[PDB]
Subunit: 444 residues, 4 copies
């Protein structure tokens, strides 16, 4: 296989950029895919019962044509994200509809409109080739990716690229995603691989880390400062765990909300101390399908003050949505910020505007990250200030099982997938920094 | 009669500060009041049928003792605000409860805990006396007021005083309000009277103007810039009218939402061109009492785009609340801001968070104004850039009727009240500036 | 003649995108150029004495190869900027040095390293062709350009593209500038032509207008709000004029500093009332080569308060640098902003830091504009809110003379150049909007 | 002796508020003072040879009358600051001039125009009395102070009180400062004492700590975020030490500049790893009296990049002024911030504006702190996140000597003074939090 020659070049210690340029490209690559004819195979069934092992295929697919500003990457490792799982169960809607509609725009966008969809929105690996107009990345460069795909033809994004109107999430609204031996990305998705991490560790933070960085640290989100009290929902999950790391690393105090004592112990292993178990507390913020219970908002706030010395939180890091959002608005301090990047329990939010207007509060929407924020989030990983949260790794063959585990919230850490890497534990080229941070790296 | 002597000194050309200091203070003053014994007067009645003319009394009341950082003001004119009307009908609760509870804190706070409540949250007049520790205002200074009363003992308010935790609205959570011949205020409520306006015109903008300035113009609100498209609900009302003025004056484009062709004509008089009549279009944002119709959100946004050349608004100036808020979040441009200072149709807001998070929008809460913002809003009036919106003036003795007219939304402009001023049209000391802006000044009449 | 057919398609009513696609491309085009061999023809002479008519040639040059993300544009008109002039006299260094060094990066960048340099940093015209990966612009589209050329490969610029580390100014640090019949630009430089303007009018605002917009209006600069007092140096020049327009249209008060009464009347024609003639007042901010005179700073501050009723400016719009910068820091209000985008009188600034730190002031640097800011500036032109300032127009063959006119500031409006346009007055397709604004459009002629 | 009774109540475990209220006030108190008669006792003498042990007297002085919004505090400990030292040598002017001029305003301000000046701008102690209008503080409350005295009569300060125009620094532009047994402060200067610190430790951070907080952490300064690179001049001094602490505790990376290997070891003791010894490197930023050397600027930039892996600093924490400011502007990253609160080496700054405008940098002035910022900085001390930096402690009698040590930079840590406290080590009320942090608390000695 030409593929074997690529992997052998990576696993050797020695290959120079010209050696990568001179390698023959394979004529196919192994990829985890969805099949267009199966869009409706889950109809009438409840979301919890839909089994991603039944919809995810392991196929050999041809390589796509490389366009300007793009790179073909040999993928050593990837990860499973929530968006991958939703895609794998054809929810909220099949991902093919957008591929087909976008494909009408031009021959280039038509490349993605195929009868199969290669999924995955994280990656760590090695650049094999770059298209026209690219100078900043070369064959051989070790990379991770962020998943924002923006064209930047509209002016709207030129003061923060999340404002670009023509926006796709790579591996979700794009083909040729990361759960595969090769991937196609824009070069403005590439970031330098942290050298103290293995391939699977380096591929794990991207999507959730960068989302939490924009949402909590950056000026485009909550603009955290040291001393702040931060209420963090779901603090042991992917997102919430990065939020907790950001709160502690920036000199602030996270108030961690979890659902079980073992999740509380995960929060403690990250160094949090104020942890609220909402299952043990029994918060019922909604008394109806339609009405909430302000008494319970107030009980949450009192609990928070037990940990803060009577202070209300400066920031709420929201993403459960409707179930918690009314409480989040109520408990926030006068002048404070509720920052939201998801609505996992429901997107129709309801809140008492008296608390927001009369106390000068603010609800700020945030959505993954611009290239600078993604670079900054990954830089904090590379400096050893933020650590990966891997809790289990699967082989590419096993991605269906991996997706299930995420679907059923089976692990608290990230679930990684080896793609071309033949085993865990490869890729580290800074052993000193890794030794410095080893216990934290392995905490999950 | 000591009060007559005070009025005479004001109406005379040329009373000096020492003259005001030498005037004897009367032992009572006439005030529009509520009586503690009547707070249950409107029980079991619909808010529509509650008549302020039955609750508001014209009483002679003694002068309060003057505390540090305070001023006694001879009031020439005041205005009726929504908070005055709500107070006059004992909604959502009687103002007496807060007066009593707050009065426990100290002898100074107990001054306000009386069996009567003098209302009013705007004023224009002349300083008569100042308490201990005051250097910036003197007897004889011509003043308007803003209605934020903050103690500033807590550090919280020292980077924007709206964050002060111990905050009262003068005339609502305080006694000795402006609908009366005299009033007591903190000196950090005083602002210089605009010289081209009459007393009743000068007392007219304070509350709603300053609220709209913070909400739309200042960096603590939406931070308007020229070129922005701004959707303004209820654009002929007091608040919305000031918002429209600020949009135009700042070089932005207001998209005015009104309920009637008459109100649309009012918006045209202010200089607006893009006007949507929600009754002509018949928007139904709510299907149930529980479920909204996104088709109608979309129909609104289409209408807006007809006026803007395909563009979505950078800013939504919200204050109707539940009825409109969903639509407001939906139509806002990617990266845009919904700024809210009230929920007049109801405070339980419901919106689709997908539009907010996925399009990076924000909802910013605002509430009247810090002293700097209130100074800036009044300064724009004094420079002739923003104009009062008086539509009708009453005598102090008929304040009840004034309240009723506000209760029933009878005029689009502010409703003013003469207090000590014997007639309308007095108090102008810059006739040149007045002449330059006279037509705009009178547009709401 | 293939170029003639291109022009005829443009001048005709109604050529469609497919017609432009079908036109044969010429094998050369006429262009104003510098010649690499001549870069020392001014060595050892005073900058004032260097004649651009002696260095600017009119050549037939081959067409460049079109790369990804680029457009070939048929250019109807352009403009002379200060960077064009500095280029034409090989100052501070010859433009060829950078073209050569940058040409070593890739074959694409190597396209610009030629023995001739086609200058020009503004354009108005019609898209002929687009390179690989372009969906937003098509043959036939009427365009103006902004001059920022950024690759956006670094993450640095993805929260404001002015932070990109690899940026070039088109027509100064790139070849194939706008003073020619054809030009090559990135498609992320293209903006829609304002339809009420002629070709030469539409080409004139771009560089200076976008710079002034970022500097004064945007949150990345001074973040103007209505009511602000703004000191504007050189208020009749190219940058100063747009700043004056922005201050007025945003509801603020420009304090216009000029050097002659003729310029003062230009400012009055733009609507400004508070105007200071630095030559009439005789300001000498510098005592000698090394020390300033704070008494003159203070005399300027007193003159400003004569126009503001005792208020110090919220914002100083700086671009003269050393001669004025100490004064600008001094006169700024407590908490105010000095925003700076040039140092035309000298770049070693000297100021008294006591005033900056003890009064919580800030100095903010600004440099042309990101694509969103350039779009917003051009959008305000298209809306009729900001007007072009054309004072004179030359034919492409006369570009040398035109450079000279700018070298010696013979005019205060912009100097435009026709390129393919055979005469002035062509290109208007919104006659009603032009008619509404015609007096202001022509105010500078 | 009434003063002994006050001390005994403090040293007692359990005096209640009513007990402090019942204590008789003494008719005099011991105070470190300057005497008006001796203003010109150092004339023609170089600031180095001026001795504060000659000009500082220890006197018995009557108690001032307590005004509205004020507290009389029994002072257990204080601190020597740079402003104290400048005062003690009558530089740049004698403190008495302002005291007299301000004393001309009212009888309250005339309280401070006395033939003696009690100095001191930090305090830790116990409230004895409060004046009219004070609810938030009571006799018995354990307090530290910040030194901003603002009247807040102007609107200007009501969105950040550092913008107040009528602003004095307590103990410098005010009498009855902290180097004494009793002091008079506005109650809006009072903050809760950190319970894990001794009296002398609690009095030490106030001024320099709040200044560094506003300058580096708050949005009114540089707005630090984790990951930032921060160049910190004078990193072992009073200001620079707190700045290093904030940089580390906020997740940023301080690049600490010091002048000697011993100071470098101090920075290591605070937890910093990247340390440049300006005297080991021998930086010569100025060639002569009037011109600088960009090669030295660049050499500093390259040394910084050795520690950051080739990244330039996001923030420069400036306060040496003229000697370093040019370099500071140059080394700052594109889009970065230079934040300045002093000019100890000279206030006429000279920098090359090309680097500031073409790379979109900003210079932000900062000055001590508003009450919210001072509260936040003291809160970080109370939470155990920022630690006092006491290096040496004197008795009130030795205050003269203390000033001298600070005048000659004898000590890197803050220099503290016991006032009423009989000895060191007293006042700790949270022994477990102290035990948790004891190594850090004592790191400077
Ligand atoms: Cl594509
Ligand atoms: Cl009170
Ligand atoms: Cl190029
Ligand atoms: Cl000044
Ligand atoms: Cl005083």
């Amino acid at each position: 296989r030409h593929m074997q020659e690529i992997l052998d070049a990576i696993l050797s210690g020695d290959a120079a950029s010209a050696d990568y340029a001179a390698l023959a490209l394979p004529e196919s690559y192994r990829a985890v895919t969805l099949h267009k004819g199966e869009e409706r195979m889950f109809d009438g069934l409840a979301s919890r019962d839909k089994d991603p092992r039944k919809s995810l295929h392991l196929d050999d697919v041809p390589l796509p044509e490389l366009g300007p500003g793009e790179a073909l990457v040999a993928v050593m490792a990837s990860s499973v994200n929530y968006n991958t799982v939703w895609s794998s169960i054809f929810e909220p809607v099949s991902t093919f509809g957008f591929l087909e509609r976008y494909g009408r725009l031009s021959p280039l966008t038509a490349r993605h409109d195929l009868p199969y969809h290669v999924l995955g929105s994280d990656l760590a690996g090695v650049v094999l080739r770059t298209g026209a107009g690219v100078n900043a990345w070369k064959p051989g460069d070790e990379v991770v990716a962020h998943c924002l795909s923006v064209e930047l033809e509209s002016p709207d994004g030129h003061n923060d690229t999340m404002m670009d109107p023509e926006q796709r999430i790579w591996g979700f609204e794009t083909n040729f995603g990361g759960l595969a031996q090769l991937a196609l990305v824009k070069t403005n998705q590439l970031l330098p691989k942290p050298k103290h991490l293995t391939w699977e560790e380096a591929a794990s933070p991207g999507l959730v880390n960068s989302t939490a960085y924009r949402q909590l640290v950056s000026r485009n989100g909550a603009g955290l400062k040291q001393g702040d009290n931060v209420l963090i929902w779901g603090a042991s999950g992917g997102l919430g765990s990065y939020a907790t790391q950001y709160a502690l690393a920036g000199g602030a105090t996270p108030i961690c909300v979890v659902s079980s004592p073992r999740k509380a112990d995960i929060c403690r292993a990250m160094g949090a101390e104020a942890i609220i178990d909402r299952s043990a507390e029994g918060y019922r913020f909604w008394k109806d399908e339609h009405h909430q219970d302000p008494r319970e908002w107030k009980r949450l706030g009192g609990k928070i003050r037990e940990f803060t010395g009577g202070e209300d939180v400066d920031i709420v890091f929201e993403h459960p949505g409707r179930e918690t959002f009314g409480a989040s608005v109520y408990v926030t301090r006068k002048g404070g910020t509720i920052v939201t990047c998801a609505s996992t329990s429901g997107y129709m939010h309801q809140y008492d505007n008296r608390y927001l207007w009369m106390s000068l509060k603010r609800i700020v929407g945030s959505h993954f990250a611009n290239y600078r924020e993604a670079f900054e989030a990954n830089r904090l990983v590379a400096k050893g200030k933020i650590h990966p949260t891997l809790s289990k790794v699967y082989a590419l063959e096993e991605t269906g099982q991996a997706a299930l585990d995420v679907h059923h919230n089976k692990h608290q850490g990230k679930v990684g997938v080896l793609c071309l890497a033949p085993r865990e534990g490869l890729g580290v080229t800074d052993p000193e920094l890794r030794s410095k941070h080893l216990t934290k790296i392995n905490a999950f």
